[PDB]
Amino acid sequence: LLSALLTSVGINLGLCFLFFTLYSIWVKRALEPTNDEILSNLGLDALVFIRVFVFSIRVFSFASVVGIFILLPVNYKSMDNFSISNVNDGSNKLWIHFCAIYIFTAVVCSLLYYEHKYILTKRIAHLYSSKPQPQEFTVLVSGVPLVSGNSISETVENFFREYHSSSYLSHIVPAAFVSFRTRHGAAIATNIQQGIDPTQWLTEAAPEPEDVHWPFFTASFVRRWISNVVVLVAFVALLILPSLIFQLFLLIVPPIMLLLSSMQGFISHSQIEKSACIKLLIFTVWNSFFANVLSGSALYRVNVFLEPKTIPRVLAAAVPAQASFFVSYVVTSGWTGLSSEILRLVPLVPSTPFCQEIPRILFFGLLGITYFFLSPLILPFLLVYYCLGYIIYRNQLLNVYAAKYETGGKFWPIVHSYTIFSLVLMHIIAVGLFGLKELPVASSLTIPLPVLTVLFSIYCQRRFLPNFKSYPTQCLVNKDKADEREQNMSEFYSELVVAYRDPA
Amino acid sequence: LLSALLTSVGINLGLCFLFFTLYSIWVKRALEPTNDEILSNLGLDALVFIRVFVFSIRVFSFASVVGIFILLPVNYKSMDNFSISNVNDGSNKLWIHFCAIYIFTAVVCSLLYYEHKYILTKRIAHLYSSKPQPQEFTVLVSGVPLVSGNSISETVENFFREYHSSSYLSHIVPAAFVSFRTRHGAAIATNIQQGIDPTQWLTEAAPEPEDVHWPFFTASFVRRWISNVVVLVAFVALLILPSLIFQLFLLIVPPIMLLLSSMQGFISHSQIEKSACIKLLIFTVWNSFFANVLSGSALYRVNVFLEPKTIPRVLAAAVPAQASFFVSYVVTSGWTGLSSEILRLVPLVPSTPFCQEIPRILFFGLLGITYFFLSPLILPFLLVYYCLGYIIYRNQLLNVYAAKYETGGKFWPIVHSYTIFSLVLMHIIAVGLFGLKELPVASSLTIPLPVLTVLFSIYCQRRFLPNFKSYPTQCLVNKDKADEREQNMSEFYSELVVAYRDPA
């Protein structure tokens, strides 16, 4: 089998060039800038995207070295002879895999810990050095009460003038954009329930003026609730070398998810794309990983996940068999993805690659973590993909893309949570596998690993993640005070008050 | 069997009097006061307690009438001949039970809707008419940073003076009680993350000065985290007519749960008792309902709940058989509970009956809802219990109890959530039972009932429940402004600043 896999790779390389030819009928410039240049020139989303690649390179450089030089010779010309499945049942060499599963997990968790601190330092620093933006001082208020004898405008200003008299500026219009004097003031309007009735006078931080999903305002509350039901139904209906054809059809799914999320009741394109990103993560895990591992009907797969006590064995006995599939998958989707982006085949639309690429990076990471333990020969393919991606994307972000919004580093929590999922899924597989390999002690001793990993995640959920949703009082106050001395707020406020005028 | 059940009731009545005799070796006065007198004289917790009884009386007066005059004759001298189990398999009379399950559920949900509105009206009104209390303006800050060259006191005042300069008053002491000028000010300190690091400068509204669990402050953060692990372990270890003996041992469980919760890291006796209340709800559901229904070992019961697709049949086939058990249980625990309280056998300690009685009321409600559908003859026993309870407790709250704290109506969310659980469990049983009774159409059509019930619950979770955790800006501001005209805040503040002095 190894020579067939190498042949497949050669075929895919040949296809790459044939497609470039049909279409027609940089490294130093990408790598030299440092991360501080990325934060100043592109911003936090670009920086997180790059750090996701760095994280993956570190995770898999480690995994590749251990996988290839320590575990691979234990496991060991078919691909299978290099997998854990070639280890004798009951073997004490499985304790090497056991140590590796805790060390690898500890390393991944350590790397996540590091990235959380790194990214937050950059995020707090970004706030302190940046200029004030209209979206930082503006709240979108919705569910404005219908008051006889009064317009929506009158209802909104009376509410905010009465309850936020020290911070209210002005507003524009059953919803309105309300401006505040300070970031802290806006935080209060969005963090503390406003009216007696919590389902009205709803507050959310405003998106950028240029990122407002203006069609949002067309629908009434009932009308948009009806549409979000339709979106969910359509999403589920969507969920429920010829492999190239498969990949080519996957290339149109992101557009589907975006148009689908656009009618779900979001107020911004950032939310629509983030929502589509999440739908793609769900979609890819279901339609690529579980669909190929748990081969069968959609009903069969659903029934598998209704019986938790058997999941470890269903996956431990199903996943290893797909290692050769996934090498092909990664190579095909790898070059399809990278060539598609270089040649701009998608618009031939999101202003950034995040919606479509974060799910590719993360899906590959799922396979990397899962197969480090089970079949290490996948790891060098993933490592090459990530290294090429890193070079290519540093160039594409600097010279090709033109983001129409900034979301701080709000994609980072996706990466964290998805990574914990990848580790936990792998741990579940390992528990099941040590069971199948007749090493029940390891199977039992590995139960605490998912638990500690989840507790680690919870620690991070309480310790780091809240700062990606909002900034704390200490931070916002220090900046509001700095702005009072450093920024010309008397002009900022004149822009702020008309920033959200509907440009029509 | 019916004559044996009547004999058992007669025996229990005889035992009641024998026990009163050994111990020794009002209705108009309880019922005449209205709910406004309860709110003014006893407060919101007493009012909620009474409304829980009113809710149960209305739920079971309805259920008793339908159960006894509509379903009972359909079902129909053993007790079993009056149960749903006596209905022919495949019978169209099961559509009566089917209609009754939706009507009953709609009625219970309607009654919950009503109570949520009623209770909140009383809660908002209570806030507007009451005098300011020290606990409304005080925040307990914990996780105060260790700063070289500075005391904890210095660290706390510098943080609040710098970030809450418009509202800070004073504080007393790795934790401190910090006072604010307004309720809104305190709300900001407790609702918005304070420091950069969310695990430090933690803020929580202070409990009453007389309700502070002072031992809390003895432990360091690590030391109390160690203890809460011990509490969980001890709790689980506790979880894992001779029926009187059983009930008598259950009477010591509340003391165990209270001492157990006292070392878990709570800051007040209100939290300890509420925590114990929750542990008792968990304990009773596990050790009384599931232990008797799912007869077997603890491991067996745990395994039952690891297979969701079979739960409906395991319970549908197990619960109906216990109807005679539960009639005896309700009668025995009913008189044991009421006589124990009248004679003060528990102190021969909580200042109120809430910790111990809310779980009795709610457990009985679980049985009422479950057996309305399956065996209606239980319902009159529950109805008598609730009616006697209502009379007895109105008297005990007015003349016997002396609460050492006020928690608003914070027990109400327990009642809501527990009630939704009771309805959902009953719906699960009904789905399983219509399956067992060969009426698969009803089994299928009942699936939406748990779903709508849960969506109703979610609606209430967003619509009503947040107001039981805190008051909204509109409410707090209207009151802070009223206090500026109506209350002598210049004296309140002098009491506020020393209110939490450790009385030692």
Ligand SMILES: CC(C)CCC[C@@H](C)[C@H]1CC[C@H]2[C@@H]3CC=C4C[C@@H](O)CC[C@]4(C)[C@H]3CC[C@]12C
């Ligand atoms: C059998 C298949 C369908 C299982 C997949 C479901 C679970 C295990 C995975 C798939 C993708 C994941 C999500 C991706 C993005 C986000 C946004 C963040 O703000 C909170 C967590 C959250 C919401 C993740 C939690 C867990 C998740 C929902």
Ligand SMILES: CC(C)CCC[C@@H](C)[C@H]1CC[C@H]2[C@@H]3CC=C4C[C@@H](O)CC[C@]4(C)[C@H]3CC[C@]12C
């Ligand atoms: C077998 C398949 C379906 C995987 C197992 C699913 C369960 C047991 C595990 C795997 C990883 C876990 C998640 C890891 C990260 C986060 C982010 C936070 O915002 C909420 C909790 C949340 C979302 C966890 C919930 C439970 C979780 C989804």
Ligand SMILES: CC(C)CCC[C@@H](C)[C@H]1CC[C@H]2[C@@H]3CC=C4C[C@@H](O)CC[C@]4(C)[C@H]3CC[C@]12C
């Ligand atoms: C098989 C047995 C162990 C099942 C029992 C577990 C579930 C179904 C029940 C038992 C008691 C219930 C709880 C009682 C009190 C409260 C406090 C409130 O602020 C939020 C909900 C919450 C936390 C309830 C949610 C559901 C609950 C946890």
Ligand SMILES: CC(C)CCC[C@@H](C)[C@H]1CC[C@H]2[C@@H]3CC=C4C[C@@H](O)CC[C@]4(C)[C@H]3CC[C@]12C
């Ligand atoms: C068979 C036994 C174990 C019962 C079934 C358990 C599940 C499916 C259901 C029954 C009732 C439900 C609960 C009803 C009320 C609340 C209060 C809110 O604060 C959080 C959600 C929460 C806590 C729900 C979560 C899920 C729930 C616990």
Ligand SMILES: CCCCCCCCCCCCCCCC(=O)O
């Ligand atoms: C198993 C032990 C060996 C471990 C070897 C680890 C090597 C890691 C190399 C990571 C290089 C990442 C460079 C990122 C540069 C950047 O910050 O953009």
Ligand SMILES: CCCCCCCCCCCCCCCC(=O)O
């Ligand atoms: C197990 C065999 C492989 C050994 C490990 C090889 C590590 C290769 C990755 C080095 C970091 C490259 C970072 C990307 C930018 C670049 O190409 O310079």
Ligand SMILES: CCCCCCCCCCCCCCCC(=O)O
């Ligand atoms: C293998 C299961 C456990 C997973 C969790 C491992 C987490 C390890 C990282 C946390 C310790 C970080 C210590 C940093 C100290 C410093 O600041 O120098």
Ligand SMILES: CCCCCCCCCCCCCCCC(=O)O
């Ligand atoms: C028996 C089948 C098991 C699989 C069930 C999968 C359920 C996943 C539901 C989506 C959870 C993520 C919610 C996203 C919230 C958001 O938009 O930020």
Ligand SMILES: CCCCCCCCCCCCCCCC(=O)O
């Ligand atoms: C065997 C199947 C089990 C499936 C378990 C699915 C668990 C879904 C968890 C949803 C998490 C949603 C978190 C949102 C947090 C946020 O709002 O930021």
Ligand SMILES: CCCCCCCCCCCCCCCC(=O)O
């Ligand atoms: C307080 C936080 C607790 C977190 C617990 C997270 C548990 C996630 C599931 C991982 C363990 C699954 C093990 C199944 C073993 C089996 O039953 O065969």
Ligand SMILES: CCCCCCCCCCCCCCCC(=O)O
């Ligand atoms: C039952 C034990 C669960 C432990 C799971 C790991 C949770 C993370 C522990 C903290 C790691 C960071 C240590 C440095 C703390 C500091 O100096 O701030």
Ligand SMILES: CCCCCCCCCCCCCCCC(=O)O
């Ligand atoms: C088969 C899996 C079903 C899902 C149940 C297991 C997941 C339990 C939830 C764990 C995440 C808890 C997130 C809140 C953390 C916190 O307390 O701050």
Ligand SMILES: CCCCCCCCCCCCCCCC(=O)O
């Ligand atoms: C099945 C249809 C018949 C329904 C009959 C319902 C009778 C309900 C009686 C409830 C009385 C509750 C009195 C409570 C007094 C109070 O507010 O304290």
Ligand SMILES: CCCCCCCCCCCCCCCC(=O)O
């Ligand atoms: C199905 C047969 C029973 C018929 C319904 C009987 C209703 C009895 C409850 C009436 C409300 C009593 C309220 C408690 C205070 C009191 O006793 O006056």
Ligand SMILES: CCCCCCCCCCCCCCCC(=O)O
């Ligand atoms: C049987 C499943 C559905 C359960 C949910 C039923 C909820 C019914 C109560 C909501 C409607 C209340 C209308 C009140 C109108 C008014 O204010 O007069």
Ligand SMILES: CCCCCCCCCCCCCCCC(=O)O
């Ligand atoms: C397989 C066994 C199924 C039973 C699992 C029961 C888990 C119940 C855990 C307690 C949930 C309630 C949390 C209370 C939070 C609070 O203190 O307010």
